[PDB]
Protein backbone atom coordinates (compact mmCIF):
# COMPACT_ATOMS: atom_id res chain seq x y z
CA UNK A 1 0.00 0.00 0.00
CA UNK A 2 1.16 3.62 -0.57
CA UNK A 3 3.88 4.75 1.80
CA UNK A 4 2.61 7.47 4.17
CA UNK A 5 4.48 10.71 3.49
CA UNK A 6 4.55 14.37 4.51
CA UNK A 7 6.16 16.62 1.89
CA UNK A 8 7.17 20.27 1.96
CA UNK A 9 9.39 22.83 0.24
CA UNK A 10 11.75 24.97 2.34
CA UNK A 11 12.69 28.17 0.48
CA UNK A 12 14.53 31.11 2.04
CA UNK A 13 15.54 34.67 1.24
CA UNK A 14 13.08 34.93 -1.64
CA UNK A 15 11.75 38.43 -0.93
CA UNK A 16 12.19 40.23 -4.26
CA UNK A 17 13.26 43.91 -4.41
CA UNK A 18 11.50 47.19 -3.40
CA UNK A 19 11.99 48.64 -6.90
CA UNK A 20 9.81 47.73 -9.88
CA UNK A 21 9.24 45.00 -10.92
CA UNK A 22 9.51 43.98 -7.21
CA UNK A 23 11.07 40.60 -8.07
CA UNK A 24 14.31 39.28 -9.51
CA UNK A 25 14.82 36.71 -12.25
CA UNK A 26 15.91 34.36 -9.43
CA UNK A 27 12.68 34.71 -7.46
CA UNK A 28 10.74 34.15 -10.68
CA UNK A 29 12.82 31.08 -11.61
CA UNK A 30 12.37 29.60 -8.14
CA UNK A 31 8.61 30.27 -8.12
CA UNK A 32 8.41 28.31 -11.39
CA UNK A 33 10.72 25.53 -10.19
CA UNK A 34 8.66 25.26 -6.99
CA UNK A 35 5.46 25.04 -9.07
CA UNK A 36 6.93 22.23 -11.17
CA UNK A 37 8.00 20.34 -8.02
CA UNK A 38 4.60 20.68 -6.31
CA UNK A 39 2.81 19.79 -9.56
CA UNK A 40 4.90 16.65 -10.22
CA UNK A 41 5.91 15.45 -6.72
CA UNK A 42 3.42 17.21 -4.42
CA UNK A 43 3.69 19.50 -1.40
CA UNK A 44 1.60 19.64 1.75
CA UNK A 45 3.00 23.09 2.57
CA UNK A 46 5.85 25.50 1.95
CA UNK A 47 8.20 26.79 4.64
CA UNK A 48 9.66 30.28 4.33
CA UNK A 49 13.03 30.66 6.04
CA UNK A 50 12.86 34.48 6.28
CA UNK A 51 13.85 37.66 4.48
CA UNK A 52 10.36 37.72 3.00
CA UNK A 53 10.58 41.26 1.56
CA UNK A 54 13.85 43.01 0.67
CA UNK A 55 15.27 45.25 1.76
CA UNK A 56 13.20 46.78 4.59
CA UNK A 57 10.14 44.49 4.77
CA UNK A 58 6.62 45.92 4.68
CA UNK A 59 5.14 49.05 6.25
CA UNK A 60 1.76 47.59 7.24
CA UNK A 61 -0.63 44.74 6.47
CA UNK A 62 -1.96 46.60 3.38
CA UNK A 63 1.54 47.07 1.89
CA UNK A 64 1.42 46.53 -1.86
CA UNK A 65 4.58 44.42 -1.64
CA UNK A 66 2.47 41.50 -0.38
CA UNK A 67 0.89 41.35 -3.85
CA UNK A 68 3.89 42.44 -5.92
CA UNK A 69 6.62 40.31 -4.34
CA UNK A 70 4.64 37.37 -2.93
CA UNK A 71 1.13 36.67 -4.26
CA UNK A 72 1.59 37.59 -7.93
CA UNK A 73 5.00 35.93 -8.09
CA UNK A 74 3.91 32.56 -6.66
CA UNK A 75 0.82 32.42 -8.87
CA UNK A 76 1.08 29.24 -10.94
CA UNK A 77 -2.25 27.37 -10.52
CA UNK A 78 -0.47 24.36 -9.02
CA UNK A 79 0.51 26.58 -6.03
CA UNK A 80 -2.94 28.13 -5.52
CA UNK A 81 -3.95 26.41 -2.27
CA UNK A 82 -0.58 25.36 -0.84
CA UNK A 83 -0.30 26.84 2.69
CA UNK A 84 2.86 28.76 3.53
CA UNK A 85 4.25 28.75 7.07
CA UNK A 86 6.39 31.81 7.61
CA UNK A 87 9.10 33.21 9.86
CA UNK A 88 10.97 36.54 9.71
CA UNK A 89 14.52 37.56 8.83
CA UNK A 90 16.69 40.62 9.42
CA UNK A 91 15.26 42.62 6.51
CA UNK A 92 11.74 41.84 7.68
CA UNK A 93 12.61 43.44 11.03
CA UNK A 94 14.03 46.56 9.41
CA UNK A 95 10.32 46.98 8.61
CA UNK A 96 7.05 46.03 10.30
CA UNK A 97 6.93 42.35 11.27
CA UNK A 98 3.53 42.58 13.00
CA UNK A 99 2.24 43.55 9.55
CA UNK A 100 3.44 40.19 8.22
CA UNK A 101 1.78 38.41 11.15
CA UNK A 102 -1.39 40.42 10.51
CA UNK A 103 -1.37 39.48 6.82
CA UNK A 104 -2.18 35.93 8.05
CA UNK A 105 -5.81 37.03 8.30
CA UNK A 106 -5.82 38.74 4.87
CA UNK A 107 -4.53 35.84 2.70
CA UNK A 108 -5.64 32.24 3.16
CA UNK A 109 -2.37 30.50 2.32
CA UNK A 110 -0.21 32.83 4.48
CA UNK A 111 0.24 31.41 7.98
CA UNK A 112 2.34 33.43 10.46
CA UNK A 113 0.53 33.70 13.81
CA UNK A 114 3.39 35.06 15.94
CA UNK A 115 7.16 35.67 15.65
CA UNK A 116 7.80 32.16 16.98
CA UNK A 117 5.43 29.24 17.31
CA UNK A 118 5.08 25.46 17.10
CA UNK A 119 3.63 23.48 14.20
CA UNK A 120 2.38 19.91 14.63
CA UNK A 121 1.69 17.39 11.86
CA UNK A 122 0.63 13.78 11.69
CA UNK A 123 1.65 11.84 8.59
CA UNK A 124 -1.62 10.65 7.00
CA UNK A 125 -2.59 7.02 7.62
CA UNK A 126 0.19 6.56 10.14
CA UNK A 127 0.91 7.17 13.80
CA UNK A 128 4.10 9.08 12.91
CA UNK A 129 4.14 12.71 14.07
CA UNK A 130 6.30 15.68 13.04
CA UNK A 131 7.02 18.81 15.08
CA UNK A 132 8.38 22.04 13.62
CA UNK A 133 9.41 24.97 15.82
CA UNK A 134 9.58 28.23 13.89
CA UNK A 135 12.04 30.61 15.59
CA UNK A 136 12.57 34.36 15.27
CA UNK A 137 16.37 34.52 15.33
CA UNK A 138 16.28 38.33 15.01
CA UNK A 139 14.65 38.94 18.38
CA UNK A 140 16.62 36.04 19.89
CA UNK A 141 19.99 37.37 18.73
CA UNK A 142 19.57 40.86 17.31
CA UNK A 143 19.15 42.27 13.81
CA UNK A 144 22.31 41.76 11.75
CA UNK A 145 21.45 44.91 9.77
CA UNK A 146 21.79 46.86 13.03
CA UNK A 147 25.58 46.29 12.99
CA UNK A 148 28.28 47.22 10.48
CA UNK A 149 29.74 43.71 10.80
CA UNK A 150 26.28 42.30 9.87
CA UNK A 151 26.74 39.67 12.58
CA UNK A 152 24.00 40.06 15.27
CA UNK A 153 26.01 41.17 18.28
CA UNK A 154 23.17 41.24 20.87
CA UNK A 155 19.34 41.43 20.97
CA UNK A 156 17.59 44.77 21.21
CA UNK A 157 15.30 43.48 24.00
CA UNK A 158 16.69 41.28 26.77
CA UNK A 159 13.29 40.14 28.05
CA UNK A 160 12.19 39.02 24.59
CA UNK A 161 15.38 37.09 23.83
CA UNK A 162 15.25 35.42 27.22
CA UNK A 163 11.54 34.62 26.86
CA UNK A 164 11.91 32.97 23.46
CA UNK A 165 14.97 30.98 24.60
CA UNK A 166 13.04 29.73 27.64
CA UNK A 167 10.19 28.83 25.29
CA UNK A 168 12.48 26.77 23.05
CA UNK A 169 14.10 24.95 25.96
CA UNK A 170 10.67 24.06 27.35
CA UNK A 171 9.11 22.94 24.07
CA UNK A 172 12.13 20.86 23.09
CA UNK A 173 12.26 19.07 26.45
CA UNK A 174 8.59 18.01 26.13
CA UNK A 175 8.43 17.33 22.38
CA UNK A 176 7.63 13.64 21.93
CA UNK A 177 7.13 13.66 18.14
CA UNK A 178 8.76 11.19 15.77
CA UNK A 179 10.69 13.89 13.86
CA UNK A 180 11.53 17.24 15.47
CA UNK A 181 12.62 20.15 13.28
CA UNK A 182 13.73 23.65 14.29
CA UNK A 183 13.74 26.55 11.80
CA UNK A 184 15.04 30.11 11.86
CA UNK A 185 16.46 32.71 9.54
CA UNK A 186 20.07 32.76 10.87
CA UNK A 187 22.40 29.77 10.41
CA UNK A 188 23.91 27.72 13.20
CA UNK A 189 26.66 26.50 10.88
CA UNK A 190 27.43 28.05 7.50
CA UNK A 191 30.61 28.26 5.41
CA UNK A 192 29.52 31.33 3.43
CA UNK A 193 29.62 35.14 3.66
CA UNK A 194 27.78 35.48 6.99
CA UNK A 195 29.08 32.23 8.52
CA UNK A 196 28.03 30.69 11.83
CA UNK A 197 25.81 32.79 14.11
CA UNK A 198 27.62 32.91 17.46
CA UNK A 199 24.39 33.58 19.34
CA UNK A 200 22.79 30.36 18.00
CA UNK A 201 25.93 28.22 18.38
CA UNK A 202 26.18 29.24 22.05
CA UNK A 203 22.49 29.25 23.00
CA UNK A 204 20.51 27.15 20.49
CA UNK A 205 22.90 24.35 19.43
CA UNK A 206 23.18 22.84 22.98
CA UNK A 207 19.41 22.49 23.14
CA UNK A 208 19.33 20.91 19.67
CA UNK A 209 21.93 18.41 20.90
CA UNK A 210 20.41 17.64 24.32
CA UNK A 211 16.92 16.96 22.96
CA UNK A 212 17.98 15.08 19.78
CA UNK A 213 16.51 17.46 17.20
CA UNK A 214 16.31 15.97 13.69
CA UNK A 215 17.50 19.04 11.75
CA UNK A 216 17.84 22.81 11.92
CA UNK A 217 16.58 24.59 8.80
CA UNK A 218 17.73 28.10 7.94
CA UNK A 219 18.46 30.66 5.24
CA UNK A 220 20.35 34.00 5.59
CA UNK A 221 23.41 32.90 3.59
CA UNK A 222 22.37 33.15 -0.06
CA UNK A 223 23.12 29.64 -1.33
CA UNK A 224 22.53 25.93 -0.58
CA UNK A 225 24.36 23.83 2.03
CA UNK A 226 23.94 20.53 3.82
CA UNK A 227 25.90 20.14 7.05
CA UNK A 228 25.90 17.39 9.67
CA UNK A 229 27.74 17.05 12.97
CA UNK A 230 29.29 14.04 14.67
CA UNK A 231 25.99 13.39 16.48
CA UNK A 232 23.96 13.09 13.30
CA UNK A 233 22.17 16.42 13.69
CA UNK A 234 21.47 17.82 10.23
CA UNK A 235 21.71 21.43 9.08
CA UNK A 236 19.58 22.33 6.05
CA UNK A 237 20.53 25.80 4.75
CA UNK A 238 18.20 27.03 1.97
CA UNK A 239 18.64 30.73 1.29
CA UNK A 240 18.70 30.91 -2.51
CA UNK A 241 15.21 32.12 -3.51
CA UNK A 242 16.44 35.54 -4.70
CA UNK A 243 20.27 35.72 -4.65
CA UNK A 244 23.17 33.34 -5.17
CA UNK A 245 26.44 34.06 -3.42
CA UNK A 246 29.49 31.81 -3.91
CA UNK A 247 31.41 33.11 -0.88
CA UNK A 248 33.23 30.50 1.17
CA UNK A 249 34.56 33.09 3.60
CA UNK A 250 33.67 31.08 6.71
CA UNK A 251 34.72 27.60 5.51
CA UNK A 252 37.19 27.11 8.38
CA UNK A 253 34.88 28.61 11.00
CA UNK A 254 32.67 25.51 10.65
CA UNK A 255 34.07 22.40 12.42
CA UNK A 256 36.03 20.08 10.10
CA UNK A 257 33.84 17.55 8.28
CA UNK A 258 30.49 19.23 8.95
CA UNK A 259 29.99 20.49 5.40
CA UNK A 260 28.46 17.67 3.37
CA UNK A 261 27.27 19.60 0.31
CA UNK A 262 27.53 23.18 -0.90
CA UNK A 263 26.34 24.94 -4.03
CA UNK A 264 26.73 28.66 -4.59
CA UNK A 265 27.58 29.19 -8.26
CA UNK A 266 27.24 32.92 -8.92
CA UNK A 267 25.60 32.25 -12.30
CA UNK A 268 23.03 29.82 -10.90
CA UNK A 269 19.47 31.02 -10.58
CA UNK A 270 19.26 29.80 -6.99
CA UNK A 271 17.37 26.87 -5.52
CA UNK A 272 15.46 25.45 -2.58
CA UNK A 273 15.11 22.26 -0.54
CA UNK A 274 12.51 19.48 -0.74
CA UNK A 275 11.79 17.52 2.44
CA UNK A 276 9.94 14.16 2.37
CA UNK A 277 9.06 12.49 5.69
CA UNK A 278 7.88 8.87 5.89
CA UNK A 279 7.75 6.43 8.84
CA UNK A 280 11.06 5.11 7.46
CA UNK A 281 13.19 8.28 7.25
CA UNK A 282 13.26 11.98 6.41
CA UNK A 283 14.82 12.91 3.09
CA UNK A 284 16.14 16.27 1.96
CA UNK A 285 16.63 16.95 -1.75
CA UNK A 286 18.32 20.15 -2.94
CA UNK A 287 16.79 21.34 -6.22
CA UNK A 288 18.26 24.07 -8.40
CA UNK A 289 15.92 26.65 -9.91
CA UNK A 290 17.01 25.12 -13.23
CA UNK A 291 14.95 22.16 -11.97
CA UNK A 292 18.14 20.12 -11.55
CA UNK A 293 18.52 17.91 -8.46
CA UNK A 294 21.86 18.56 -6.76
CA UNK A 295 21.97 16.57 -3.56
CA UNK A 296 19.93 14.15 -1.48
CA UNK A 297 20.54 12.84 2.03
CA UNK A 298 18.48 11.17 4.74
CA UNK A 299 17.86 11.75 8.46
CA UNK A 300 16.57 9.07 10.82
CA UNK A 301 13.41 8.88 12.87
CA UNK A 302 13.95 10.12 16.43
CA UNK A 303 13.45 8.16 19.70
C1 LIG B 1 2.67 47.65 11.78
O2 LIG B 1 1.70 47.00 11.04
C3 LIG B 1 0.47 46.78 11.74
C4 LIG B 1 -0.36 45.90 10.83
O5 LIG B 1 -0.76 46.63 9.68
C6 LIG B 1 -0.16 48.15 12.02
O7 LIG B 1 -1.45 48.04 12.63
C8 LIG B 1 -2.41 48.24 11.51
O9 LIG B 1 -2.16 49.54 10.96
C10 LIG B 1 -2.86 49.68 9.73
C11 LIG B 1 -2.20 50.78 8.95
O12 LIG B 1 -2.24 50.51 7.56
C13 LIG B 1 -4.30 49.95 10.10
O14 LIG B 1 -5.05 50.25 8.93
C15 LIG B 1 -4.86 48.70 10.77
O16 LIG B 1 -6.13 48.99 11.34
C17 LIG B 1 -3.94 48.09 11.86
N18 LIG B 1 -4.25 46.68 12.01
C19 LIG B 1 -5.48 46.18 12.19
C20 LIG B 1 -5.58 44.68 12.27
O21 LIG B 1 -6.48 46.90 12.31
C22 LIG B 1 0.82 48.99 12.84
O23 LIG B 1 0.36 50.33 12.98
C24 LIG B 1 2.18 49.05 12.16
N25 LIG B 1 3.15 49.71 13.02
C26 LIG B 1 4.01 50.65 12.59
C27 LIG B 1 3.91 51.02 11.13
O28 LIG B 1 4.82 51.18 13.34
FE1 LIG C 1 18.72 37.32 2.88
FE1 LIG D 1 19.26 37.57 6.03
NA1 LIG E 1 -3.88 32.58 6.63
Nearest ligand 1 atom to the CA of 61 is 5
Name the residue with the closest Cα to ligand 1, atom 16.
61
Query: By the 8 A CB rule, do 233 and 208 touch?
Result: yes
Resolution in A: 2.3
Map out the domains of the chain as residue ranges.
6-299
Cα(44) to ligand 4 centroid in Å equals 15
Query: By the 8 A CB rule, do 194 and 248 touch?
Result: no
Name the residue with the closest Cα to ligand 1, atom 26.
96
Cα(15) to ligand 1 centroid in Å equals 21
Going by the annotation, the residues of the binding site are 13, 51, 54, 90, 185, 220, 222
The string of DSSP codes covering the chain is -PPP-EEEEEE-S----SSTTSS-HHHHHHHHHHHHHHHHT--SEEEE-S--STTT--SSTT-THIIIIIITTS--GGGTT--EEE---HHHHHS-HHHHHHGGGTSTTEE--SSSEEEEEEPTTSS-EEEEEE--HHHHH--GGGSTT-S--S-S-HHHHHHHHHHHHHHHHH---SEEEEEESS-SS--SSS---HHHHHHHHHHHHHTT-SEEEE-SSSSEEEEE-TT--EEEEE--SS------TTGGGSPTT-EEEEE--TTS--EEEEEEE-SSEEEEEEEETTS-EEEEEEEEPP-
Mutate to test the pocket of ligand 1, among 56, 92, 102 (most ligand atoms within 8 A of CB): 102
What are the phi and psi torsion angles at 159 (to 5°)? -65, -45
Mutate to test the pocket of ligand 1, among 57, 58, 60, 88 (most ligand atoms within 8 A of CB): 60
Cα(51) to ligand 3 centroid in Å equals 6
Half-sphere exposure (Cβ direction) of 44: Cα atoms closer than 13 Å: 14
Going by the annotation, the residues of the binding site for Fe cation are 13, 51, 54, 90, 185, 220, 222
Residue list, CB under 5 A from ion ligand 3: 51, 89-90, 220
* Superfamily, domain 6-299: Metallo-dependent phosphatases (3.60.21.10)
- What b/e string do you get for 30-58 counting C-beta neighbours within 10 Å, with b at 16 or more? bbbbbbebbeeeebbbbbbbbbbbbeebb
| Number of other residues whose CB lies within 10 A of the CB of residue 20 | 7
Nearest to 168, CA basis, from 215, 135, 120: 135
| Number of other residues whose CB lies within 10 A of the CB of residue 176 | 9
Cα(158) to ligand 4 centroid in Å equals 30
Amino acid sequence: TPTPILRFVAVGDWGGVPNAPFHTAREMANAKAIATTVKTLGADFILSLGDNFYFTGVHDAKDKRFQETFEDVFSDPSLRNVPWHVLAGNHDHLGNVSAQIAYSKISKRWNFPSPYYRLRFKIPRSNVSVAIFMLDTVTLCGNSDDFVSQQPERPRNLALARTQLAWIKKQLAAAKEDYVLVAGHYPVWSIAEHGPTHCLVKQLLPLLTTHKVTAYLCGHDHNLQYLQDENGLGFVLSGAGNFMDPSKKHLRKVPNGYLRFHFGAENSLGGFAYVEITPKEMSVTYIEASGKSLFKTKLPRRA
